[PDB]
């Protein structure tokens, strides 16, 4: 796999604009949610993903997609059913692979979160 930085930044950018709560824009601090570190082993956010793309940290487009999946899974695990954070996370899970496709990324439909 190759890292297509333009295609990967387009994908993050589309997700950033669809994030109406701005809940995925920045890393979660203990200051914000004191118990978050206790629940979530692999925190990740769209600013951190953009930096990972721009720096070449991700080896492939697939790794960027897996980072977005992880970010969405985190919010579904942490947040109770019915809260706006849980509901936007569910919406993201529903659309993120379509957004990836719409940016020209290859999606493994059977394997994808």
Ligand X SMILES: CCOC(=O)Nc1cc(-c2ccc(C)c(NS(C)(=O)=O)c2)nn2c(C)nnc12
For a second copy, the binding residues (CB under 8 A) are 1, 38-39, 41, 59, 62-63, 66, 73, 76-77, 81, 86, 90, 93, 108, 110-111, 113
- Find which of a second copy, ligand X, none residue 111 binds, CB within 5 to 8 Å per kind: a second copy
- Find which of ligand X, a second copy, none residue 23 binds, CB within 5 to 8 Å per kind: ligand X
Buried b (16+ CB within 10 A) or exposed e, 31-57: eeeeeeeeebeebbbbebbbebbeeee
- Which residues are near ligand X by CB under 6 A? 21-24, 28, 75, 78-79, 83, 85
Closest distance between a second copy and the C-beta of residue 81, in Å?
6
């Amino acid at each position: 796999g190759t890292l297509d930085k333009a295609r990967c930044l387009a994908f993050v950018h589309q997700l950033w604009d669809k994030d109406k709560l701005k809940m995925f824009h920045h890393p979660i601090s203990a200051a914000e949610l004191p118990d978050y570190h206790k629940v979530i082993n692999y925190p990740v956010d769209l600013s951190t993903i953009r930096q990972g793309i721009e720096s070449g940290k991700y080896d492939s487009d697939a790794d960027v997609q897996n980072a977005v999946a992880q970010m969405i899974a985190n919010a579904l695990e942490y947040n109770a059913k019915g809260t706006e954070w849980h509901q936007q996370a569910l919406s993201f899970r529903s659309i993120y692979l379509d957004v990836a496709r719409q940016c020209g990324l290859s999606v493994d439909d059977d394997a994808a979160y």
